[PDB]
Design a protein around this ligand. Structure first.
Ligand SMILES: Nc1ncnc2c1ncn2[C@@H]1O[C@H](CN2CC#Cc3nc4c(N)ncnc4n3[C@@H]3O[C@H](CNC(=O)CNC(=O)C2)[C@@H](O)[C@H]3O)[C@@H](O)[C@H]1O
Ligand SMILES: Nc1ncnc2c1ncn2[C@@H]1O[C@H](CN2CC#Cc3nc4c(N)ncnc4n3[C@@H]3O[C@H](CNC(=O)CNC(=O)C2)[C@@H](O)[C@H]3O)[C@@H](O)[C@H]1O
Ligand SMILES: Nc1ncnc2c1ncn2[C@@H]1O[C@H](CN2CC#Cc3nc4c(N)ncnc4n3[C@@H]3O[C@H](CNC(=O)CNC(=O)C2)[C@@H](O)[C@H]3O)[C@@H](O)[C@H]1O
Ligand SMILES: Nc1ncnc2c1ncn2[C@@H]1O[C@H](CN2CC#Cc3nc4c(N)ncnc4n3[C@@H]3O[C@H](CNC(=O)CNC(=O)C2)[C@@H](O)[C@H]3O)[C@@H](O)[C@H]1O
Lengths: 264, 264, 264, 264
């Protein structure tokens, strides 16, 4: 089929990419970076996140694969030495696909009335423009809390091992269609009160963050982060869209967690 | 239908129970504490947990209701003043049912070879008999970690607001069929290593705790706690069984969380 | 003596300030905001922090007092209704003084070679300019760790109830001459490793933060926060200087903690 | 001088002990385990804790040394290969001494009226006899909080790297004369409230734990743990007594922390 290979850009990953392209030339495989059906990422999890956002408009037509030239990644979970066996199985096809849930983020603005939507593979976070961060947290149209602190992080399941984990969040197996909200340095005293605990939401629950004082926020989506002005609302929901991985062996999530944090 | 009412045993709850029995006498409602179809608990969440374990062999034939004579409970979420409206709607029927997932705990012994199974509505925990607690944690037959510490807690979704919450766990909406494992004071240094983070498992995942040095453990299931000796394995899995609640109004889980921890 | 009164600027605090000035006019008390010996702050803890940094060059010649027109503050711990009794005792004098330790922050730059020093009453923090925050942490010239995360917070004892507390830090009685370092969302996996725990340092210990990749950081000192460029080192040490409070009654730190976080 | 050597009891530590005794026989050094002035512990930190409590009645007449035959310990911080150089320097004398603060625990009983005092090198903890743990926490005769949870831990400075650390406590340099209180799984909801944060107390502050419902508690002091009945009060204070170490090289606390938790 059609395929493309993205590279971290260092000597190691570029050469592996050129050797894989040569190996694909021995099969009915066409290099196409406009409408690929297979997207191979060579580098780390950062490289894999860039590949996902490169092709986020053709998610349902693409199976992703990650190769780690550095340490083991959670998305880039193939070794460089397995590259030749990867070509053959990819060329033959008949592989299985695995799907992970994604996070939908909607940003509504003031001035007039317009929206922007983004898809996250790891998480979306909200912080302030330097000043104090105060937002009302609304869950399914019910006011839940007034958050004062540094920010908030909404993670996908496969994102729970990333930023979510550093904030105290739970690690969730990616077969659970859910999103998880964690706090960044919340203020809790006699007059200010947050839940503290991470919150895990199922499909069709909508979490809305609404400004109190300032309308300017730093909003990140995976590695992309930008200052949004005149923001009226930020809505989080489990996406109906899913990222599809090509799978060729059993590499269970909990072993990947074991290998990344316990020992390898 | 057939119904029974359990009471915390204080003057307030006993009198409310006698007044509800009188109110049921005005309808085709028969008091039966052997094969009830409706189980009303009057007291707190402790009273409701005792009612659940009272009738755990007829879970699929019972709809539970909780009335809180003290503060708001997560299971006992009806006010005493609503008792009269409760009788009528219960007597008429046509109510909806809501189902929450449960936790299955299997305890395998040595000596010969035998098993015991228990059902938890909140959580099951494992601690040592005074000595150091060391257990190997195995996830789907894969050795995940060697835990050294005070103990481990496996929570249901509706249990996440209880012991799980005090241990740093995430709060999970009860519509998610999952269980959550949290650590109690894990030892982490150069030679000893745990994941630290809470872990959230889906249906059909099996978490096994296996002894290393001692075979004696204090194992709790909700409020019940007992010293198990000659223990070879403790297995945790999302139960196929569910507790059914009678519902008459919308009282969302996240508002119940709000009312219990933020403000009311 | 000479005295000045700073105000939050709202109607309540301005009027209390004018009434106290009138009350001081009945005694040998001269209003002087250039070389005061008594500095009264009327507002909240934010107002008190501004007063401290207003007069940080004459710390050893000044006794500070805080009045809270809003809720109880940790520095602004007098009620407005006590204002008249405050004037008399302040005018008579013979009061006792209480001293709290402070934090010294030294910022060394590249380009050529120059330093800047700041004094913190609550804390000093370090974050990155948007990009990833990576710094080497050196304790008394010994490399202790390579920190990857959102940032670091170095707190005084009286600062431990502020930002430090939201980051998981311990609350320290202000009679202990010490500083406390806490982490903001540290990355910990197989290859990256921080201590995790807050660290409490005594007098004469020097903690140095040294850049790895980028030399630009957002450095805050109490409420003041600014982007420092070409930074070569940030050094933290318990200051030899102390802030002096005028005290007229016993209001113990742990009761102030109780009143602010438990109940009042 | 007079000296004794305690051993973990395994083949490695016993043989090292016999070789050191032989080496001391070449100097004016007398083996005496009744009134030693030098106490050498060969094993791990557990072995060193037993040696401390062995000779806790002659603390001011004893300099302790630890040798680790397993991994590095915080008290047993000499390698076995350094044993011969240890003998010579110990025999010659002229060494320096380093002193660490200790924790005093007083247990007052009912029935009649009697007290017991204990000294801790790491920590003292309080847990319940199975039932719920509820205690009133009083700081310098001021009621601070009503604690509901699994238990409480009061740590010395050198104890902060042990149990305290697993409970979220700060690591404190042992030159600070202080004690640190940490919570074990506190209950916090609308009606029950604890501070949450670790608390660090200076010398002469007295923390008192007082029973509410039950008078039976499991009280530990370092590795010793026993069920106390008819308990009326448990009082914690920084001891006036100090443990003295013989020091022959610079091995800073923060490097020892680095070596034990970061890398070695
Ligand atoms: N204070 C913070 N703490 C923890 N994580 C933080 C964080 N601030 C941001 N992030 C994460 O960085 C992601 C953006 N980076 C790409 C990635 C990735 C990635 N994904 C996963 C995953 N799913 N599971 C487990 N580890 C994962 N990692 C690893 O994360 C590490 C942290 N990153 C950096 O040091 C520098 N950042 C980049 O190069 C861009 C990397 O080594 C990476 O291998 C954000 O999306 C956020 O999650
Ligand atoms: N260290 C610890 N920290 C936190 N929770 C702990 C704990 N040790 C045990 N538990 C919990 O106690 C349950 C057993 N108790 C019945 C219940 C219940 C219950 N269920 C839920 C729920 N689903 N969500 C939210 N709050 C819930 N609560 C509330 O929990 C409080 C704590 N309990 C006690 O003080 C005394 N214990 C009992 O009377 C028996 C009560 O006020 C209660 O209203 C265990 O199952 C475990 O969860
Ligand atoms: N993510 C964060 N979490 C927690 N604290 C954070 C934080 N980011 C910054 N800070 C603190 O704010 C201080 C700067 N503010 C003045 C003050 C003060 C002050 N001092 C003490 C003290 N010693 N003990 C106990 N509470 C104290 N507080 C209270 O702190 C609250 C938080 N502040 C805000 O909401 C808005 N900020 C300001 O108006 C300026 C206030 O209600 C205040 O009454 C920084 O110095 C840092 O500490
Ligand atoms: N849930 C818990 N989490 C963390 N620590 C816990 C704990 N429950 C008890 N403890 C500690 O055990 C001490 C009693 N043990 C002797 C020691 C010691 C010692 N002292 C220090 C120190 N100062 N700094 C840093 N590490 C230190 N350690 C190390 O601690 C480890 C934990 N221990 C065990 O696994 C088995 N226990 C024993 O053999 C007896 C050991 O490897 C040891 O090398 C208690 O005093 C309490 O602190």
């Amino acid at each position: 089929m059609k395929y493309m290979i993205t590279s971290k850009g260092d000597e190691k990953s570029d050469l592996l990419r050129l050797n894989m392209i040569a190996g694909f030339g021995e099969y009915d495989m066409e290099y196409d970076d406009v409408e690929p059906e297979i997207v191979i990422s060579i580098g780390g999890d950062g490289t894999f996140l860039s590949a996902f956002h490169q092709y986020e408009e053709r998610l349902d037509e693409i199976a992703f694969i990650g190769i780690h030239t550095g340490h083991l990644g959670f998305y880039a979970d193939w070794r460089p030495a397995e590259a030749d066996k990867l070509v053959k199985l990819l060329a033959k096809g008949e592989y299985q696909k695995v799907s992970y849930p994604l996070l939908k983020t909607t940003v509504k603005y003031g001035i007039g009335k317009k929206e922007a939507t983004y898809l996250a593979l790891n998480e979306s976070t909200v912080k302030s423009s330097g000043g104090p961060f105060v937002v009302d947290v609304v869950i399914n149209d019910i006011h839940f809390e007034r958050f004062r602190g540094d920010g908030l992080c909404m993670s996908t399941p496969s994102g729970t091992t990333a930023y979510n984990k550093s904030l105290g969040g739970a690690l969730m197996h990616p077969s659970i269609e859910a999103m998880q909200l964690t706090e960044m340095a919340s203020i809790n005293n006699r007059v200010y009160r947050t839940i503290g605990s991470p919150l895990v939401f199922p499909k069709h629950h909508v979490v809305s963050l609404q400004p109190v004082n300032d309308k300017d926020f730093q909003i990140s989506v995976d590695h992309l982060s930008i200052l949004h002005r005149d923001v009226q609302e930020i809505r989080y929901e489990v996406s109906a869209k899913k990222i599809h991985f090509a799978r060729f062996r059993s590499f269970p999530f909990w072993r990947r967690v074991h290998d990344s944090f316990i020992e390898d």
